[PDB]
Paper text:
Calreticulin (CRT) is a 46 kDa soluble multifunctional protein that was initially identified as an endoplasmic reticulum (ER) chaperone for monoglycosylated proteins and is also involved in Ca2+ regulation. Similar to its ER membrane homologue calnexin (CNX) ectodomain, CRT is composed of a globular domain, into which a flexible arm-like P (proline-rich) domain is inserted. The globular domain is made up of seven concave and six convex β-sheets forming a legume lectin fold. We have investigated the CRTs of two distinct parasites, Trypanosoma cruzi (TcCRT) and Entamoeba histolytica (EhCRT), for which a pathogenic role has been proposed.
Residue numbers in the entry:
A (entry chain B), B (entry chain A): 14 to 207, 289 to 359
The structure:
Amino acid sequence: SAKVYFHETFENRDKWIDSTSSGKALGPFKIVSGKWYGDANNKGLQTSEDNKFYIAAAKLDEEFSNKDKNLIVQYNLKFEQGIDCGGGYIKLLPKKSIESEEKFTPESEYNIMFGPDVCGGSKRTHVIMNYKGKNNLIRKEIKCESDDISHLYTLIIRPNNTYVVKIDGVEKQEGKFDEDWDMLAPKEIDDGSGIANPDYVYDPELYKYDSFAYIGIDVWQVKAGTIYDDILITDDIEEAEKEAKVILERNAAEKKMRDEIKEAE
Amino acid sequence: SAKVYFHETFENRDKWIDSTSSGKALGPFKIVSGKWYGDANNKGLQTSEDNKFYIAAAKLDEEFSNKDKNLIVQYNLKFEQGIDCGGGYIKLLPKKSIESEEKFTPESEYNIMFGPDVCGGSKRTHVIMNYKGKNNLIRKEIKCESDDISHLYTLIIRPNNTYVVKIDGVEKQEGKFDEDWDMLAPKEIDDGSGIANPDYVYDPELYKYDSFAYIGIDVWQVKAGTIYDDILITDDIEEAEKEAKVILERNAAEKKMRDEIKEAE
Ligand SMILES: [Ca+2]
Ligand SMILES: [Ca+2]
Ligand SMILES: [Cl-]
Ligand SMILES: [Cl-]
């Protein structure tokens, strides 16, 4: 029944290859239990060195397309350090984008970039959708969390051509891809065009991507310490909302350990 | 006292020159009373032919800077035709970018693009801010009216680095340039970057423009018939709300005349 295309728990970091094709100046990930957590046997991937880029990619369990199917993207992310400026997002890439993991690059083509990103007064949850060569921003602010405990970001994409974004299981945006992005106005940014243009024609498949093949992380960090806890990708709505209560139960536990180290101070 | 840099009432259209430099097929503007109106002596600028572009520009009474200064743009716009797809908006341009009005084009550099824009399910009020050579979208949806009577779009930009948007005098958005735009991540749309990057630094003057000189209209119309009624630009908030209240009765009258024509149908 349910198909899970990916579920990383970071017991290890074996599927994840650091880019050897960026021009950086990259930092190292470490698999670390965290200063506080809901399960001592559990485990996550952490950026470990300040003011550096972090770029790594991993192949998914199976190449797939979400055409005429659901798709849920859902991963748990912790800004343990008290983030000041740094990304916590992920990208998902088609097979055609990268000949293999080490060649993943910021300029690498992605289908979707999703997740928290914090710098100064900007705290938002990306939902960038790639369409016909352009990356399109969500058009609809979705703030992201900024404290030091893990939160669960969920993206939900139905073939109805609509989406849903939840954080910690509570829906925070819902709308239809043609109404909430300007994907069908490609020259609005560069060419001073409006949304109303010729070539604005409704696309039943703004939700569809032919190929999902890699997941990738490419964040800048000034204060390192961001931790990717768990990552899940699947086509089954109940399966994703079956694994989340596990994770949010453990984040609750994580919170109670959290506040006891802050009175040890 | 109050400085009014521009107040067009469209008794005529003389100050407005149709672009001879866009590469596009233009339609003709006509000065019209409208199918319904609040004063038969007042006219507006109307797009008159389906599936054409409408591109013209006009010089303001004075070149100015809003540095250390308030600034309000407030114009009345009516989609009398029952719009399906069309702008909408206006642009404000510095004294460069165009040697004179006829050379205005969508690709011309502008300071601000503001106003309604409707196409299919996309109905929003633009507040595009030009920064660093790139046009930045407001990142926070602001819906726009889409019926067939006139509505008064008002944007005010204070040297505090904040804005607000009203429609028919009712404030519908409020915020700070550094939080509700992503102006300080110019390479996020292209380049596949995040907001958090090494070149994010706060700018107190995201509100300031060295040169305000031209105003322009360059909208696409599927169903033509949009009327630009009145345009006001000024550095004084009172006087802007003073001139607002006259225009908003004229819309009330325009409103009573309208439901009075469709009871005949
Ligand atoms: Ca885990
Ligand atoms: Ca008028
Ligand atoms: Cl986004
Ligand atoms: Cl906008």
